[model samples]
Target: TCPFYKKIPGTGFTVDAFQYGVVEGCTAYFLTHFHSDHYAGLSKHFTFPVYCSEITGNLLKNKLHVQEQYIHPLPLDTECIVNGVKVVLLDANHCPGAVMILFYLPNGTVILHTGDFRADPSMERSLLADQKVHMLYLDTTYCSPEYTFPSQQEVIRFAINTAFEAVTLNPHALVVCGTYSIGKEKVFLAIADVLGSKVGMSQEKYKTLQCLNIPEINSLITTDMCSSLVHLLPMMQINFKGLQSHLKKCGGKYNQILAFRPTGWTHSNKFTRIADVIPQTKGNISIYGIPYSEHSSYLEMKRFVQWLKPQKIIPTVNVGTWKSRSTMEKYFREWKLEAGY
Candidate 1:
């Protein structure tokens, strides 16, 4: 049943635990979040009742659009026993349905897995701050000293500024910014808010966001309504010789187009643009790139570990612990930080 290929961070196992060892040997598997990196290859082996939040469960069932034979969804903060270990799911204010997990072992040790979370004050302050935790399996993807990030608010501001610039240059022009369909829902929400309406919400995000009910904001609008913008649809509908011919014949009348490009885990280059192209109207194609990113920066990762102060922390995602820990310690020293674990 061990169906994955991930070696432990510090272990010498030739294959991932799921691929080489007995999957049934472990009591249970806790899925902290639904990002492909975290939950990929899960359906291959996990038939035992997996534990997670009901919201997360719905996400697995509906949003990620996965159908597993066995899954036991728990409410937020509720504790349960799985594979003989006590487990709990906490709200992880990441994407629409991401969550944090707390695994309690009979040996008196606890493991807090912060799937991929940020410390956005505006989005529920911090994800794992007030709670006491033992071990932390951190997201170290951006743990390098060279990486940097702008604030979430700043990203939204940039999106708006870019849109305004497009309209200013060509009043009939449409501006498009691309990001993850779900992770960057906030950016889409902000853009729609500027347009003064609730935008289209994907079936998955709408289901979850409808329940959260944040103040001032009613809900996130999805991409289905992007075509509603009158001035920006013609250039986008170009699909074949016939469509391109039609749009070209009618081009001079509409001076602009705006659309958000589709995004994924790749560079935003010419090759990347090929996939991001989405048509909003006949003459307008969406222009992507508003600098929206989901992962934490190296500085943020360093700060979070310093705040937790665990006795011995291990980055579970990386290829090796020595490199991960060594980089973390160097960053810590530069920031005058210390960790208990």
Candidate 2:
């Protein structure tokens, strides 16, 4: 039930999207980020006033085509009152404009919704120090010990190096880096800085980069398919089936294709070394799954939860095969001890 939306009993604010016909009588709406999963049921047809970071509000209006009148931009670290409840937005180190919501209910209950963020040290002072949290809605995307991975900075370094090495090994190969439409811009920015070449992207992605307003990131966008540099494609575009058609269309124009996907799912077992290069070959295209993600690792989540020490925990994602409610409690107890909570 906590997957898409959550209601703060006395408060009229709803987090994320209003799915399963829940939009009808909701008092207000809030979006954490622009990720499709978080915005599953939202569309231009949405009529509620949605609250989110300024950048996210613009994305809803311009990118998702949600009406401007329905988008309310909230500034980070600033508190605003919605129906007598004090709400504050904090940066969620997952993607651009991502935020973690803090609600101070009228009944003195404090609820926190960590909208898909990595539990990095940056949040320690601003968010982790808050001792008033009563209930926590967590992003448990990798809430198992098997999901241990390195920090995002280290993964970015590994990915950039791997891409350059692949290109160096095969001079005629076109490097295709898999990324979400919004996140993973750092990889492309580093690649562009190192190679001094324009990174190719779809029209939609280019517009998103433009709205982000980062000079260095915006300079890397290229619509041309023929570039002397790596192409930043949507995660769906670099998949096995998708690459088959792409290779057929390329028709030997590029001698080889090296694809890299940075994800936490790359390491599901204890044996897989961190950032271990696993290549899947299909004719001229070779795909590599890099261990890079924005979500917190199992250990990180333990630390985050223990630091906040909420009275109740509600996972925002479904653990593999296990019933979400039971699984959430199980991990909470196990991880707390493991993190010295």
lDDT: which candidate is best? Answer: 2
Instruction: State every prediction's TM-score relative to the real structure.
Output: 0.66, 0.88
lDDT, candidate 2, 153-177, per-residue tens: 7877876787678777877777778
Residue by residue across 19-81, what tens digits does model 1's lDDT show?
A: 233453444445655566556555534454455566557666654444555666667666676
lDDT against the true structure, each candidate: 0.52, 0.76
The number of clashing residue pairs in model 2 is: 0
Off by over 4 Å in 2: 1-5, 22-25, 127-130, 239-253, 267-269, 282-284, 319-322, 335-341
Which parts of model 1 are misplaced by more than 4 Å? 1-22, 42-46, 63-69, 120-132, 168-171, 179-181, 197-227, 230-254, 258-288, 320-341
Residue 5 in candidate 2, Cα distance off native in Å: 6.2
